[PDB]
Structures are given as structure tokens and as C-alpha cells.
Amino acid sequence: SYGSSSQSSSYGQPQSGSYSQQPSYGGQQQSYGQQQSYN
Amino acid sequence: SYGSSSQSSSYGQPQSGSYSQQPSYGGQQQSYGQQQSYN
Amino acid sequence: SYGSSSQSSSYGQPQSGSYSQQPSYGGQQQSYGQQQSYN
Amino acid sequence: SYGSSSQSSSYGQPQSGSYSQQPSYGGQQQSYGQQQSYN
Amino acid sequence: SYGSSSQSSSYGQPQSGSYSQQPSYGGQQQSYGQQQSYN
Amino acid sequence: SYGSSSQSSSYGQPQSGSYSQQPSYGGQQQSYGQQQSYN
Amino acid sequence: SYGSSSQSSSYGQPQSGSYSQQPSYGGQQQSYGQQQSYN
Amino acid sequence: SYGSSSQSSSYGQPQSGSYSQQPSYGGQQQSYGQQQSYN
């Protein structure tokens, strides 16, 4: 009688190039873990 | 009768390039862990 | 009859490049851990 | 009959580059841990 | 020489039922509007 | 030589039901409006 | 040579029901408006 | 050669119900407006 969720993200040595435009923007993550009961 | 959620994020040696534009912006994360009951 | 949530974030040796623009801005994180009951 | 939340953040040797702009701005974190009951 | 994007969302009289579980969670939206040029 | 983005959201008379669980949680929105050039 | 972004949100007469649980939590919004150039 | 961002939020007659739990929590908003140049 339970719910569970998990998210994992990782980056390795990002932005190592030279003479260039390397802007970085994070994204969106949503994790839902729940148990619901009615009456 | 429970709910659980977990999120993990990691970065390794970011922004090591030279002579470049390397701006960094964080993103959005939402974690929901709950148990609900009605009556 | 409980809810739980956890978030973990880490950075390793960030901003080590030379002769460059390396601005850093934090992001947004929201963690919800709760138990609700009606009547 | 309880709710719990936890957030952990860490940084390792940040801002070690030379001859560069390395401004640092913190982000936003919100943790909610509560138990609610009606009637 | 331009890019444009727009998103619109609306809800009308939501959650009006009685004696029920009506939890509401928002979703994710991403809008990109930009112009890029190389050399 | 420009980029533009816009997002609009609206709610009308939300949470008007009786004898019920009507929790409300906001979602995530990301708008990007920018112009980039290289050399 | 410019970037622009805008976000608008509105709520009308929220939480008007009786004898119920009507908790309200705000969400996350991120707006980026910028112009970048390299060399 | 400029960047601009704007966010607007409004609420109308919130929390008008009777005999109920109507807790209110604000959310998170981030606005970025800037112009960057390298060399």
C-alpha cells in the first residue's frame, strides 16, 4: 500500500571546448510518489 | 500506507574551457511525497 | 500513514577555466512531504 | 501520521580559474514537511 | 530575422464536486523564442 | 534580429466544492527569449 | 539585437468552498530575456 | 543590444470560504534580464 518514485541525473566534465559559445540551461523534472484512498 | 520520492543531481568539473562564454543557469525540480485519505 | 521526500545536489570543482566568462546562477527546488486526512 | 522532507546541497572547490569573471549567485530552495487533519 | 513563441492556458470553475477527492497538480510548459547566427 | 516569448495562465473560481479534499499545487513554467551571435 | 520574455498569471475568487480542505501552494516560474555575443 | 524580462501575478478575493482549512503559501519566481559580451 505505497507508491515510490526516483530520478537521477548526472553530467561529466561539461563545457570544456575553447573559443565558442557554451551557455547552459537546466531543464524541468517532476517526481510524484503517493498513496491515495477513498472511503 | 505511505508515499516517497527522491531526486539526485550531480555535476563533474563543469566550466573548464578557455577563451569562451560559459554561463550556467540552474533548472527546476519538484518532488512530491504524500499520503492522502478521505473519510 | 506518512509521506517523505528528499533532494540532493552536488557540484565538483566548478569554474576552473581561464580567460572566459563563467557566471553561475542557482536554480529552483521544491520538496513536499506531508500526510493529509479528511474526517 | 507524519510528513518529512530534507534537502542537501554541496559545492567542491568552486571558483578556482584565473583571469576570468566568476560571479556566484545562490538559488532558491523550499522544503515543506507537515501533517494536516480536518475534523 | 526573428523568432517568437507563445503559450496560453486557462481553467473554468475547477473543483466544484462534493464528497470526493479532487487534488490538483500543475504540469510543465517550455517556450523557446530566439534568433541565432553563426559568423 | 530578436527573439521573444510569452506565457499566460489563468484560473476561474477554483476550489468551490464542499465536503471534499481540494489541495492545489502550482506547476512549472520556463520562458526563453534571446538573440545569440558568434563572431 | 535583443531578447524579451514575459509571463502573466492570475486567479479569480479562489478557495470559496465550505467544510473542506483547501490548501494552496505556489509553483515555479522562470523567465529568461537576454542578448549574447561572442567576439 | 539589450535583454528584458517581466513577470506579473495577481489574486482576486482569495480565501472567502467558511468552516474550512485554507492555508496559503507563496511560490517561487525568477526573472533574468541581461546583456553579455565577450571580447
Numbering used by the authors:
A (entry chain 1), B (entry chain 2), C (entry chain 3), D (entry chain 4), E (entry chain 5), F (entry chain 6), ...: 2 to 40
The publication says:
Three-dimensional (3D) helical reconstruction followed by 3D refinement with pseudo-21 symmetry yielded a final density map with 2.62 Å average resolution, based on the standard Fourier shell correlation criterion. The molecular model shows that residues 113–122, 135–136, and 139–149 form the β-strands of in-register parallel β-sheets. Residues 123–134 adopt an irregular conformation that allows the protein chain to fold back on itself. Side chains of most Gln residues in residues 112–150 are buried within the FUS-LC-C fibril core, with the sole exception of Q124. Thus, burial of Gln side chains appears to be a factor that determines the core structure.
FUS (FUsed in Sarcoma) is a 54 kDa RNA-binding protein with multiple functions, including roles in the regulation of transcription through interactions with the C-terminal domain of RNA polymerase II8,9, in RNA splicing through multimeric binding to long introns, in DNA damage repair, in cellular responses to stress, and in mRNA transport and subcellular localization of translation. Phase-separated high-concentration droplets of full-length FUS or its LC domain typically evolve over time to a hydrogel state, consisting of highly entangled, amyloid-like fibrils, or to precipitated fibril bundles.
